[PDB]
Design an enzyme around this catalytic site. Structure first.
Site, PDB file in Angstrom:
ATOM      1  N   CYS A  36      -4.259  -3.113   1.052  1.00 21.04           N
ATOM      2  CA  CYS A  36      -3.902  -3.561   2.392  1.00 21.04           C
ATOM      3  C   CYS A  36      -4.648  -4.800   2.760  1.00 21.04           C
ATOM      4  O   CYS A  36      -4.073  -5.797   3.236  1.00 21.04           O
ATOM      5  CB  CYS A  36      -4.205  -2.451   3.435  1.00 21.04           C
ATOM      6  N   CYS A  49       0.826  -1.211   0.000  1.00 21.49           N
ATOM      7  CA  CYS A  49       0.000   0.000   0.000  1.00 21.49           C
ATOM      8  C   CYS A  49       0.857   1.256   0.000  1.00 21.49           C
ATOM      9  O   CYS A  49       1.772   1.379   0.801  1.00 21.49           O
ATOM     10  CB  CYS A  49      -0.890   0.003   1.222  1.00 21.49           C
ATOM     11  N   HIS A  73       4.025  -0.846   6.240  1.00 16.91           N
ATOM     12  CA  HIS A  73       4.370  -2.259   6.036  1.00 16.91           C
ATOM     13  C   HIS A  73       5.874  -2.467   6.051  1.00 16.91           C
ATOM     14  O   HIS A  73       6.330  -3.550   6.470  1.00 16.91           O
ATOM     15  CB  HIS A  73       3.732  -2.770   4.758  1.00 16.91           C
ATOM     16  N   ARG A 116      -5.091   2.880  10.050  1.00 17.44           N
ATOM     17  CA  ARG A 116      -6.344   2.128  10.004  1.00 17.44           C
ATOM     18  C   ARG A 116      -6.437   1.033  11.047  1.00 17.44           C
ATOM     19  O   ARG A 116      -7.442   0.350  11.114  1.00 17.44           O
ATOM     20  CB  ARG A 116      -6.581   1.588   8.592  1.00 17.44           C
TER      21      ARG A 116
END
Ligand code: SF4
Ligand code: SF4
Ligand code: F3S
Ligand SMILES: [Mg+2]
Lengths: 534, 267
Positions: A531, A63, A70, A461
């Site tokens: 994601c 992403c 990540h 998120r």
């Protein structure tokens, strides 16, 4: 005009990635929902057999919205596998870049992804700029004049008069819409700030590049620490600090006031899009091996029982495939994960998504800002409590209001404000550490032939985890379990609706052709489908 | 969405991470607001457009069939395995979408290594059969200008578009269809550490004093010598680039780099 029947939204726009939402509507209200993710890439398959040091470079490309996150998760995962304790400065630098990512991501989400669900940009052309400026100046310490807002109106008028509406083409608000409530002046204020935010986000992203090489896709992390010796210099620190200060000012003076003005106008949105269970991993460690050393702490809550926050047990995560496009029906802990694609088309064999369905002790868990904020609040976090209480008081609502689409959107702002202030504290601690003479940024390490590792990030998120099994010094298994997987994955093998699916039940739909209410709720979770699926 | 006046751009998202779209948002002088209000008409873009669902699909149709013509910018590789089913938008395969739209464009730009060359999802064993745009669509005569990187420098996209609008033609392209004005030099020939390379002065580890002093990163895997890009010259975000942050180049503007440039920490 109380519709009964299906509604499909495909593509759901103003998210990252490729999402199809299906609902069944009865008498104007959603009675059932499906979250269908329609792109698969297979990064976990691709990783098999590779050098563990390479993983972060591949997984960062999960992403580019939540860029860096990540890379950080994979590097924490491999750090953990090899047993390296990175230097203090590496923790500080990694934490500072992550803080900067939160500010960038949330500002762009509110204005550029979410706001067109609530703001009628074309209605801004009807506004009285003098009235609008008075309203803008009453909600923020930053004063705004009539001429400031007229310049925005003039630009928009030229754009609209060209008949080339560009990203506003066929907007749900064009012509008016019964679910769009703002007056012209508030629409103008929001539109002005949308446009402002397009330039401010450049600075917010640049802050990540100061230490992290570039945005998108940073390039400063290694197993054992970071590479950026220039990040120790007073010049780079000062550059970061100036960008942070300007970003924080925008958060405090522009975003949060606008969030509160919109929320006040849409207070009926406290009644829709609630969820039951919450998971968060904590973020911003002092100790890379102790999640409870983090500024936000981990926790698990079931059925909104915030008096009984449960400890997070990483062994209680399983990812289901029964309603997903993978082989079979067996849920797996990620250290035993499997990524075996098998497409059956929409609802074939009751499967409808490329996302797996993560469950914690068998339950579907919301993660992200609302989870972070509510769990921290309930743990007595003093900064989260101060900001949350002030938001509630300004809106004139009690705490029950947080369990909603409005609440989730507010929580995103709360977290932004709190993290913006905490970046300054981290920055000072980092400066103080350099001043003590600590100039070390990377530590040596050795690759084991056989190991297990896990890395945890609480990303914008929510709870991100990367899981490695090293075999013969190579990647034997690498599994990503990503926040949007939790929130937007499908049903599990107990047929439990995922958070997004559950949250849509009860949504009123005024106009089935223009189902903005579905978008309001879905966007409040800030979906990232690249994601969720990887 | 568009009629006369500003040139129409249709932006498509295939198998992608949205990092290329995010890179465009970083545009500087001109900024993205100038680009969308003054320079161009951004007539379809799933990340930022207001319309969703059927209204979004109708916006796309309106833009593609306009008598004024459009430019396509494509992000992401095209999944071709299993008849395209690994990637769908509005229940159409990405392969079908691009096959229908891209031959209608006045010009196509493949933006990012995924769209140019296949990218991360095309790395071995390529479970989705992802291909770059020109590879996937060879048979239809599509010849996209390739602006490579993961993501590319947005300077290179804007510069290509401006050139095309002024000259009504593509700039000079290299053998990988990339503009020579941006991709004509290796990263390495532009790198400030080149004198250390020449002297055989290599950092042996990231923790070393040699790394601290800014010695060459070749022994730690730097792919600058085999990578064509303008990173050291233009930099990113008006401020930095990988080697100045102490990290090797991973080769991200080259075809098949995920397999050709790995292990990233060896040369
Ligand atoms: S080229 Fe890189 S940054 Fe762009 S879509 Fe592909 S993986 Fe993402
Ligand atoms: S650091 Fe990389 S690009 Fe720079 S001189 Fe060394 S090998 Fe070349
Ligand atoms: S990794 Fe990519 S961004 Fe430039 S420095 Fe190397 S070509
Ligand atoms: Mg996974």
């Amino acid at each position: 005009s109380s519709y009964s029947g299906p509604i499909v939204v495909d593509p759901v726009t103003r998210i990252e990635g490729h999402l199809r939402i299906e609902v069944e509507v009865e008498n104007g209200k959603v009675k059932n929902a499906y979250s269908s993710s329609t792109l698969f890439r297979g990064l976990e398959i691709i990783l098999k057999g590779r050098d563990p040091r390479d993983a972060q470079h591949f997984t960062q490309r999960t992403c580019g919205v939540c860029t860096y996150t990540h890379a950080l998760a994979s590097t924490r995962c491999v750090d953990n596998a090899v047993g390296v304790h990175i230097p203090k400065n590496a923790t500080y630098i990694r934490n500072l870049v992550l803080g900067a990512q939160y500010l960038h991501d949330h500002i762009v989400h509110f204005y550029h992804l979410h706001a067109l669900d609530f703001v009628d940009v074309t209605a801004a052309l009807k506004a009285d700029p003098a009235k609008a400026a008075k309203v803008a100046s009453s909600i923020s310490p930053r004063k705004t004049t009539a001429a400031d807002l007229k310049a925005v109106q003039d630009k928009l008028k030229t754009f609209v008069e060209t008949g080339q509406l560009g990203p506003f083409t066929n907007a749900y608000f064009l012509g008016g819409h019964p679910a769009y409530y703002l007056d012209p002046e508030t629409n103008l204020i929001a539109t002005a700030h949308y446009l402002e935010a397009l330039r401010l986000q450049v600075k917010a992203a640049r802050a990540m590049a100061v230490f992290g090489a570039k945005n998108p896709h940073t390039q400063f992390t290694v197993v054992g620490g970071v590479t950026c010796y220039d990040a120790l210099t007073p010049q780079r620190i000062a550059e970061f600090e100036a960008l942070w200060k300007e970003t924080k000012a925008f958060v405090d003076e522009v975003y949060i006031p606008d969030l509160l003005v919109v929320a006040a106008a849409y207070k009926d949105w406290t009644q829709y899009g609630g969820t039951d269970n919450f998971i968060t991993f904590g973020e911003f460690p002092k100790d890379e091996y102790d999640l409870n050393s983090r500024f936000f702490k981990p926790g698990v809550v079931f059925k909104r029982d915030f008096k009984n926050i449960k400890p997070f047990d990483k062994m209680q995560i399983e990812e289901h495939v029964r309603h997903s496009w993978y082989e079979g029906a067996e849920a797996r802990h990620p250290w035993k994960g499997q990524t075996q694609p098998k497409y059956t088309d929409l609802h074939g064999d009751d499967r409808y998504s490329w996302m797996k369905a993560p469950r914690y002790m068998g339950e579907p868990m919301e993660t992200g800002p609302l989870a972070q904020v509510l769990i921290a609040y309930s743990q007595g976090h003093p900064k989260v409590k101060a900001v949350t209480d002030a938001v509630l008081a300004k809106l004139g609502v009690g705490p029950e209001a947080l369990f909603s689409t409005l609440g989730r959107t507010a929580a995103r702002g709360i977290e932004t404000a709190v993290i913006a202030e905490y970046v300054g504290v981290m920055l000072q601690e980092y400066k103080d550490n350099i001043a003590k003479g600590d100039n070390v940024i990377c530590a040596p390490w050795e690759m084991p032939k056989q190991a297990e590792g896990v890395g945890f990030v609480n990303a914008p998120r929510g709870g991100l985890s990367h899981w490695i099994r090293i075999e013969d010094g190579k990647i034997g298994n690498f599994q990503l379990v990503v926040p949007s997987t939790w929130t937007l994955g499908p049903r599990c093998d107990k047929n439990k609706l995922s958070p997004v699916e559950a949250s849509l039940i009860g949504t009123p739909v005024a106009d089935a052709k223009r189902p903005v209410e579905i978008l309001r709720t879905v966007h409040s979770f800030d979906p990232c489908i690249a994601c969720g699926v990887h | 969405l568009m009629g006369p006046r500003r040139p129409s751009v249709v932006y498509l998202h295939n198998a992608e991470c949205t990092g290329c779209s995010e890179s465009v948002l970083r545009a500087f002088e001109p900024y993205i607001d100038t680009l969308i209000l003054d320079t161009l008409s951004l007539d379809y873009h799933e990340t930022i457009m207001a319309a969703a669902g059927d209204a979004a699909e109708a916006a796309l149709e309106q833009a593609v069939n306009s008598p004024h013509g459009f430019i396509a910018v494509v992000e992401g590789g095209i999944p071709t395995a299993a008849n395209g089913i690994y990637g769908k938008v509005a229940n159409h395969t990405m392969l079908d979408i691009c096959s229908r739209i891209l031959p209608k464009a006045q010009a196509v730009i493949a933006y990012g290594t995924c769209a140019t060359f296949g990218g991360v999802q095309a790395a071995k064993p390529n479970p989705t059969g992802a291909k770059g745009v020109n590879d996937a669509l060879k048979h239809l005569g599509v010849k996209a200008i390739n602006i490579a990187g993961c993501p590319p420098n947005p300077y290179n996209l804007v510069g290509t578009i401006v050139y095309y609008l002024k000259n009504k033609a593509a700039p000079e392209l290299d053998s990988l269809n990339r503009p020579t004005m941006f991709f004509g030099q290796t990263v390495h020939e532009q790198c400030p550490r080149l004198p250390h390379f020449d002297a055989g002065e290599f950092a042996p580890s990231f923790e070393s004093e040699e790394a601290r002093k800014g010695w060459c990163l070749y022994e730690l895997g730097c792919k600058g010598p085999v990578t064509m890009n303008n990173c050291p010259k233009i930099k990113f975000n008006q401020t930095n680039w990988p080697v100045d942050a102490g990290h090797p180049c991973i080769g991200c503007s080259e075809p098949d780099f995920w397999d050709a440039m790995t292990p990233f920490y060896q040369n």
